[PDB]
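Can't attach files on this board, so I'm pasting raw text. These are the components:
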Amino acid sequence: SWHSIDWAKANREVKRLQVRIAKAVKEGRWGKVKALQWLLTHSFYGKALAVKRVTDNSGSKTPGVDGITWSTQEQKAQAIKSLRRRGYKPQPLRRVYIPKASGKQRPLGIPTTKDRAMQALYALALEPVAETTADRNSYGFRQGRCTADAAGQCFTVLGRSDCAKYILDADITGCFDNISHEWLLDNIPLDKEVLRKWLKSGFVWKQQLFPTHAGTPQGGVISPMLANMTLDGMEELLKKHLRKQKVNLIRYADDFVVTGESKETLEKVTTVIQEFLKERGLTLSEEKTKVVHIEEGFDFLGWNIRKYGEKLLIKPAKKNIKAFHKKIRDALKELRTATQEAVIDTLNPIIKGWANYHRNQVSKRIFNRADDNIWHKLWRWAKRRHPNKPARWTKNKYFIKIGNRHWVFGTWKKDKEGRLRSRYLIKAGDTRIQRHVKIKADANPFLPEWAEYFEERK
RNA sequence: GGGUUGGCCGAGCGUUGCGACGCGAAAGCUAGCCAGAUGAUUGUCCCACUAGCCCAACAAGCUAGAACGGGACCGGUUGUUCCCCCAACCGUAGCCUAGGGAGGCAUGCGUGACUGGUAACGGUCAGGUGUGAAGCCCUCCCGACAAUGUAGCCCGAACCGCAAGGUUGAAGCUGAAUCCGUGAGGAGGAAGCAACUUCACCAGUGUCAGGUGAUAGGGAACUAGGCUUGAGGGUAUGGUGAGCACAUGCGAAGUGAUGUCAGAAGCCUCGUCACAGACCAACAGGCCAAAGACACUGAUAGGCCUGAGCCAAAACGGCAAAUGGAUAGGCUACAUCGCUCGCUCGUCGGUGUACGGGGACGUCAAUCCAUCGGGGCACAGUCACCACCUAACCCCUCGUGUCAUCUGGUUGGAACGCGGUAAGCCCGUAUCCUCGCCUUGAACACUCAAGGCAGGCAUGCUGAUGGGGGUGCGGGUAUGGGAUGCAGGAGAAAGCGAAUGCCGGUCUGUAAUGGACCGGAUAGGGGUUGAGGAGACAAUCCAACAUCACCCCGCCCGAAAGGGAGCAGACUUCCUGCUGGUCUCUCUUUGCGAGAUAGCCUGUAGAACCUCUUGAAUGGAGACAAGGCAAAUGGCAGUGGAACAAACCACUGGUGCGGUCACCAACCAAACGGCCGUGAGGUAAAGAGGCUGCAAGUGCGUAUCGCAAAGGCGUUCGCGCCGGUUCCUCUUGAAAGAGGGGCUUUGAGAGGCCUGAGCCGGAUGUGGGGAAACUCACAAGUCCGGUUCUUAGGGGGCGGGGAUGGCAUUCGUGCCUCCCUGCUACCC
Ligand SMILES: [Mg+2]
Ligand SMILES: [Mg+2]
Ligand SMILES: [Mg+2]
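---
Top answer:
Structure tokens for the assembled complex are below.
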């Protein structure tokens, strides 16, 4: 009976087991890990967690080369019982090109809906290990962290007067296949047999180290985490070799930058990193990695960092505003005619992500010059669907007044009951700029203490 | 490094009523041409000259007249601000057109009335409203004066209480006397008329003066037009050499290069943090004690200026503002541009070209151009070469007229006017072939029927007091810009006793549609009338080819009813067949890149899986430690709290095999007074059957998958190049771009569709633009002829007729809703 298990305690019990394994690895035992993570993944009430996770979040409709698809409320009952380590083989992958408006067919392989449960079950009992052995200054696909905190550790490491003055950008080029299959058999402590079965078949080639998208791991829950374990370290190794030349490191999944003390320092830092990239098989490109003076700046994440005189301020980068002026322009070309309730409905959510993603930087000026340059598009859109009428007319037609600047886009229509309705553009810029509060570096959301962070902070 | 506010030059053409074909037979409208009649041929005076008078017939002094004789003048423009001279063109007259009013008329749309008719289908007046034109309305009245519209430029005020009423002033508009001139014209402006609302501030504060900025609205200039002496020759700064697609073209319609969404050309904004500002806020470097008049707070209190730069202080404060430059004075003419559909206009703004002689005043503004750089605009064209038509200004000849209007002729065209019921359909009638039925007041489902088939007709009613069907007649009704074409049939207006059709020849040009010539056919009789010639004026038929005015016979089809007759038969309709192109969808096909499961065999592990065989080498409860391993395990088991205890809250747990430890249950291979006992030595082990997992093969590149089915140029006689398609590589944020390996290609079947944009050549017209050529519109102007493109579906934009009226307030104009209700030519 699937509709009988109490989900109100599933999370509690699984989280309790995860806390146990985390606190265990906190002590240098390493043996108790492969007795709780062998007990969790071979029991009820955690196995159903994977099925529940995989059946939702889409991706449970289109199958791999099996035909089978659960999609129901009673076929996912013998699926639970059919999850055994003994007698397991994979069923390759079917390459399906996901359509794109631009036509950018991005190859995303897809596994079976029973195979996917295993990839989503073993993510448990491996996730607690990754958090406990993380790199302190590592962000990306972690729990409770946000991509804004990567800029957070820049008002501090680089913010004060002296700090550092030279930065190294760097970028790794290898795809997920280049990782040595032998190497992965000896470090990730999930299992020494299932992992061997997995790689040899497919499960690879899917994309580069991390998903191309920012929040859509459609099918794979293990792929992000393996990268965050193979690319770990790199911080104790960095600070042990070079002692006092004020070195530091940040990394948001990919896209990691290192602050040196002088150009001389950042010539062996590109060597000690190079040594710690051959034990795996993926190296750094000799085309894009540059050492940059701080007064010229660099493009890290969707942000730009520079120093003007004696002043640190980080502002929206040039090749990210231009994208936002290309996504809008291509929604006013496919939806030219529209009905004026589709212009507002389509262009509203588009101007909310680009506002949330820069809500915490010095961008009050940048939010202007980025609404006018769309205002001169709506108005030019308005006078192209009335090639005969006059200006005063198009104006009184699609521009209203609210009790403010009398010229805003919208329609002051009504409702069924005789109430004055309203619709209008967000007009990015009416967003209180907030200075974020950084996450403590050593925070670990699975240790039994420090439970007041994260959940309450969310 | 945080709060808030800004954005726009206007008006029409491309978007509704009629559109077929035959004929101007009469009237109206209109284009050339041909000849006349009448007007006009545009400032004022002198010198005329034009004649006349009878000024005697002047050397006459008078009326008055002509576009083109000569002087002297006045007014308005242009020749870069203003003054003084000079040169140039133009006027106050006559006549139309654009525009504004007043009537009738035809028509749209609906509301009432009286009626024509069996019933289909209609008619006649009065009420309310739209429309009367780039093709398509009639008489009057204004008529270059006007209404309109705006980016630039002006005003948009003082005033005193006086309850806001006047005194003003006023951007400006009308402008009378008065005087000087002969006169056109000058100097002077008596008297009137006029928008004048709303705020925000000028070293805080509470105070008075002076000032500043933006708007409600008014004003100036322009909007406000044309012709009034020609013809010829040369002269582009004026235009044209389709259209549409694209790797290769179609087509009759230049040759070339480049470009089509990561965008050529053109344009708007800003300078390396790269939209114009301004207020507060905070921070920093500075300045005056409140900086025009007066208590009021105040100096570890203020205020202000400058700041993502400087200086300077109460000044008109100055500097350079990506690199490099030019510059005086513009209600002027022309061409171009003001952030993208083509064409006309109107105000305003900068560029480029052209624009007399002196003198006076005194230039420069973050104004402008050229180059680089950053961010934006999209309905796809740009740039050179060649060939041709045109000649306003320019130069050279020959001119004596030119413009408008009205008459009388001639040739024409039409959306204006007149003629045509016909096959479809509706109704009436006649007759005939009829005959199908669930029940049925029944002669017993078979004769006077309802529920009610059907039909008529939303149970709502007649309804075997009946149904059904073609056929011959008789009334009424069609509503008509091209969209694959063709062929016969029902029908056939206008013309013909020889024709502008039709049929056969000749001949000529267009890409296609043509024009001029010859031949060829082409009607059953009989009777009145002469409608008008002619016979004149009495003396004749036409006896009606006056396309047949009116009756009888035969002729053919119909039950009569009476309908029809020689070749032609234009346009719109209903029928038959063939033929064509566009769609959607189920099949198969091969070329690409993925690709297992089942099943069968080949070697292996069972310690955590069973059943065993063995003589035993076995059965239980415990303790520690663990970068060894695993066949259902933690929907579990605990403690302390909700005292405990029901949920509820915290904390604890390594699940088994193997490692080290030890304990209890039977050993008797040990010792061994042979068994007649005593202590004590280990509880080790190996083969068999399925059962499962691993590494392999076969099952197979099979099912199952994702995309795709495009070729063209010369055979240098290989192949090359330009493309298409699929798979893989680096690239940035990108749909773009590059570099490689493959192929470069098949047939059926089911169901739909036939609507619209243009462009080209001649023939008839018209209105804008223009001097002319040409240009953009009139359903693609219409017609005809030759061509390419486009057909679910949205979004917007109009119009007509009514309702209770909601609102704002002009109090009866508009925003609105509620349907009815035509429009899509317009963008995806
Ligand atoms: Mg049109
Ligand atoms: Mg006609
Ligand atoms: Mg059309």
